[PDB]
Amino acid sequence: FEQIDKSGSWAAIYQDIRHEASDFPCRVAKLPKNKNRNRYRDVSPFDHSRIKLHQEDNDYINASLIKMEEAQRSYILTQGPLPNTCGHFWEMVWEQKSRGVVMLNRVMEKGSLKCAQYWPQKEEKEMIFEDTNLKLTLISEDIKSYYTVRQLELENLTTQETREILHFHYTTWPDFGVPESPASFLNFLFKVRESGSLSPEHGPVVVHCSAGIGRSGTFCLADTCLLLMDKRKDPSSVDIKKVLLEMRKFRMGLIQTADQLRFSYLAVIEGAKF
Amino acid sequence: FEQIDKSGSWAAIYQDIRHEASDFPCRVAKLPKNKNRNRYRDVSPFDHSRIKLHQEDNDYINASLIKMEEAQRSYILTQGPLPNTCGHFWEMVWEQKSRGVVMLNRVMEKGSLKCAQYWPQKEEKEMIFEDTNLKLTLISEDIKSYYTVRQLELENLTTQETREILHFHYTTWPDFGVPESPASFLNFLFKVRESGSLSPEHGPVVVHCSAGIGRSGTFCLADTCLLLMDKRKDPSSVDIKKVLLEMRKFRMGLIQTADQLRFSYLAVIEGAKF
Amino acid sequence: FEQIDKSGSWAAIYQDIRHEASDFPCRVAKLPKNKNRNRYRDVSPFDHSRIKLHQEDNDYINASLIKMEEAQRSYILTQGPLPNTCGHFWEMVWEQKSRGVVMLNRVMEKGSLKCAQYWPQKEEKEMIFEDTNLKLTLISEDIKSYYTVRQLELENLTTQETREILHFHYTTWPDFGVPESPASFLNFLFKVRESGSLSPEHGPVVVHCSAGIGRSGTFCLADTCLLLMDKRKDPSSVDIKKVLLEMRKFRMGLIQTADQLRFSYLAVIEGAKF
Amino acid sequence: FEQIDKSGSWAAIYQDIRHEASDFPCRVAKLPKNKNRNRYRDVSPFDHSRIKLHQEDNDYINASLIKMEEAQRSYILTQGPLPNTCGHFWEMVWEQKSRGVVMLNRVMEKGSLKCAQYWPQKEEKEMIFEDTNLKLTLISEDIKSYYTVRQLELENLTTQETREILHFHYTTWPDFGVPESPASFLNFLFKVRESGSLSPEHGPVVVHCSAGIGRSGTFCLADTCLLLMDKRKDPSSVDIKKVLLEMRKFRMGLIQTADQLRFSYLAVIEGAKF
Numbered sequence A, B, C, D: 001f002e003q004i005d006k007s008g009s010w011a012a013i014y015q016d017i018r019h020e021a022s023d024f025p026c027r028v029a030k031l032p033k034n035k036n037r038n039r040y041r042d043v044s045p046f047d048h049s050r051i052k053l054h055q056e057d058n059d060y061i062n063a064s065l066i067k068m069e070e071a072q073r074s075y076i077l078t079q080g081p082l083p084n085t086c087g088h089f090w091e092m093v094w095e096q097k098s099r100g101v102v103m104l105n106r107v108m109e110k111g112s113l114k115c116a117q118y119w120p121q122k123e124e125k126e127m128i129f130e131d132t133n134l135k136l137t138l139i140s141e142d143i144k145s146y147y148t149v150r151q152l153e154l155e156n157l158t159t160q161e162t163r164e165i166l167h168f169h170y171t172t173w174p175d176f177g178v179p180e181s182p183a184s185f186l187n188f189l190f191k192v193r194e195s196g197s198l199s200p201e202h203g204p205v206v207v208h209c210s211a212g213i214g215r216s217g218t219f220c221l222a223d224t225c226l227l228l229m230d231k232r233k234d235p236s237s238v239d240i241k242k243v244l245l246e247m248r249k250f251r252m253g254l255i256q257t258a259d260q261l262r263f264s265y266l267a268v269i270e271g272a273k274f
């Protein structure tokens, strides 16, 4: 980390990542009928790793399955739900048997609006996604300094089945740049790990920010490298650049700035001492 | 055949069929509570011949019992199971004591998911349908060039009784149109017949495709006409038009198009030679 | 055709072919050091037409260049790659600047592994052939009822140059005998032709099956005879027997049996109608 | 553990395992031509999980791939090599990219003979498996009280490639019954874990005793439960009986006596305190 900051090789390094990143088709994501299902034109799931909704009509949702073979962890990265894809977002959660949903953004950042209000803010004001026939209810919530955790009850109206989804909401990511310290970010991840949401019995955790590649990518990149740094007889054979590129084979654009790159390094380093 | 072909009157023959097609109530199927159990709104089982689930909550499944008196053969035509009807699907196979299941479509065609993955792809990852208390295990899988035959074990979790179900999967019917030649399709049929799945000792074979009327209708129409010709002293007296209409009394829309109609006559003809 | 068929003289025609078949040295192929590079002892490339690897250690690969002068089309016939020849296989595709690879067999038939998994099944798990310094990546995969077309990226790791290879995989040739109808086989051919893979702008298409002479021979014989008939003012003057023998000068044993011979005449005939 | 020893419910429990164990075909293992490739008639790999040798002629070897999805670990269980399957055993190691081979028996136990001498006992007396063209050399060995560890160099003569295989040989398993204390057994496993042989970068570790189900099964059952007991938010949701049954879906007869069962429990318990 020393040399790179000194010789200021962050932009260089990050740029070499963008250049080396794999390229795969996103045919489906580009179909005209799926334009309003994408939040950003420049952010699409590859055809090979995209999550297919279990429907005949339109199985399209902007979400990717990231399977890290060696680190032994799967993640579903997706965009913040759109006002019209909230039911799709929750149908995905259900079909993929996810236990936890990790949100890394605020429903409103800067003067724009980065994500829809896809979960109920009020216990008594539950949500019913008629398109996908699902019911979602806020059971309780624990609000903290840098993150909030909610207990949501998701119900398959078609089968009256119910499941409890843990919603981990990191709420203090700055409108600009990355956090000066990976402090809270790392604590947040440990909470997610300790919750059991990232274990094999469950479907992959659903991770999202606005586009589902920058913040989301840091979360997964960090978690994965930390797994590696602890799952390898060698304490440093793990190269986060290489890891990120592996990760990029599954979803385009993971880590959208040299800052996010530097931060990811910070987190892995500052987290390896945990 | 050559006449109809030369005069190009299939379409005409086909429309007269649609005209004479019997018409019966489909009250249960159209009940609001069954809306999610139907794949297609224009394809429902007549009340009088629909298969009833031996359950009190909801006995409905989009499946029809087609009992052909002269040919002495019964078939159950149904739609490709939906995500929420896989359990209902197997409860029917169980309750009806079927021995074979004929799948005439691939899980994915023309992009659309035309059928849920209602059976286990992996021997070691059996399926449990909790709503219907059945367990399903893939025992064996013999993949051939134009079809795959699987050997499955269905077990009623309450009684612990187990049965071997043979799953015949015709895998090469084109995404568009009908086969140019009926050879492989007939060999598939003969193969289904050889297994004894169609035997009167067993409940009706369960046949399905996308809606359970086109390819499915073709399979049973061909089979039944071959049974008649082989049985009737005058193989020529076998009017397949009359056979179809007779079948159309049990499930609506059997044979969706002219080409499918043409393919059926040919199949019976080529099959006639055995 | 009907004559030969009615007189039942295919076998006879076939043996005369085996009699007139030219005979050339296969010295290199038979060298002790190449023993492990040959799938079958009775199938070797003549020295004069064998494909030479642009390497000094060992330039041998069981592959033959079949250049047909009149039809103006060249083919490379080779055996299904062995575990140790996948790298050699791709170095040839690269060096020879081929655009398409035609696979006419399934990886597993009649139980036996008739071909190594020489290409990546997973977009995210590319293949590296260290002995030949090439990287191979599955880019796309369009699975159809009777064949699968893949889009692959081959990259010389030394030069970083990349090329798109189209892999046409005819997947429904029966484990035993030949197709009853040549329809799907011809459509496959036409599909191969449409891709421009056979274009003179490209190096020879690489064709292969188990030994690289039966199904492979059928594909190129049919294709070449269709080229002649379409070109020659007298489509009848096209003697496929003479065409085959002409091809047999470049690689031994093209067309392994009478039935394959019969299937070839039919294919050309049915294909003749276009 | 208390209650079961008291109420002496070991035989009961073990018996319920044998009764509940899955049953899958072993067609290939039963082919007449593979009789001398099996050490025990009653011990065969299931067709679905058997390791296929990468050859066209005969891909049969009595070895199974055990994939524990949740515990996130794969193992290849196989019989002690036979005088004629030593090359097959080593070809498997190579093709499957295994890094370590765990041997739980002595080449001679009691008055019989439980396994072949498939590795070289002398640095200067290396081994050449001509059938599969492999060279194996003892590079060094570390002999201990209850186990020995060897550094072997395996070379693909066909490609001159070489790899270093770690051979972990637990040498103090008693001729009868199980070890009174899981002490050494647990230490042995930790050595294997610490060696990195059980990590994801490598192919699955190859585990064997004589038949490859009793001792081998204890090793894997113990390792897997220990992973679970540490990978689950819950410190006891892990039921070794359930785990063993899961494991049995991949290889028949894992854990061949109620003693081995009790011992496996001992090991998991006595090992959970590590």
Ligand SMILES: [Ca+2]
Binding pocket: A048, A049
């Ligand atoms: Ca995929």
Ligand SMILES: [Ca+2]
Binding pocket: B048, B049
């Ligand atoms: Ca009735």
Ligand SMILES: [Ca+2]
Binding pocket: C048, C049
């Ligand atoms: Ca030459």
Ligand SMILES: [Ca+2]
Binding pocket: D048, D049
């Ligand atoms: Ca398997």
